Amino acid sequence: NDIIKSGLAEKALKALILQCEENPSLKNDKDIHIIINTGKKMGINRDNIPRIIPLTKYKLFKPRDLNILLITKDPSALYRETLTKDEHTSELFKEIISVKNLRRRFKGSKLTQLYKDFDLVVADYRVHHLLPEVLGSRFYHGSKKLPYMIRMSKEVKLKRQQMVEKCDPIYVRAQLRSICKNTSYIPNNDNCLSVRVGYIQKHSIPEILQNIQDTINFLTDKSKRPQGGVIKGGIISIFVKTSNSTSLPIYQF
């Protein structure tokens, strides 16, 4: 909790926020990231699979706020039908599409339009490895719209047996709330790492600071492995920045 106490983090955030109003070039920048310099190489190959960091104190977003796309296994008739009819998940998704339909309908420039329309992309965990080819490069560089894995039903698999195909609307709704409210990160095999912590004009400076400590606590705690405890060896430094602003230091070792 030392980083919250230090005034350097507060003073940097005030400068970063102040700049975004003054500078025209940063007008479209809305999210605040923290850049972490881990002491040693993580050693985890980038699998493009998001890992969720639970932010206990505060909630980054709610399912209602964002344009959510769902990519389901073929056929999508079962999953689309159950989600749409049930009251809880009726309005939870912008659109529901299958992998094959997504490949056929959207190609070339149509992919770029799909990226702009939707703020969050989620997919059945089974089809996730297929998405990089279908969605294209634009989704899978930069980490702004990486698809999130979700499990449709709580049923588990056993070797030499067949999965029963079910859809639990409450469970699907339950996971999606966790994704939007909590922040997420993607491992890579180096020092550097980027995690979203707040949103301009939505979170006050003290709120953003609390999220930062929650992110640091989860990433450093070895008890949270494999999801957490990935930054071993301490943190040399931490910066704060928007998408296009420069990195402002907030903690140095």
Binding site: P54, Y125, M149, I150, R151, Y171, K181, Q227
Partner: peptide
């Protein structure tokens, strides 16, 4: 929760809590 096919599931799965399941 683990699926033998797809080891990526065990990391990067949404944590679910009582507050999250409760209706708004």
């Amino acid at each position: 929760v683990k699926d033998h096919r797809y080891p990526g599931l065990t990391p990067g799965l949404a944590p679910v809590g009582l507050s999250d399941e409760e209706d708004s």
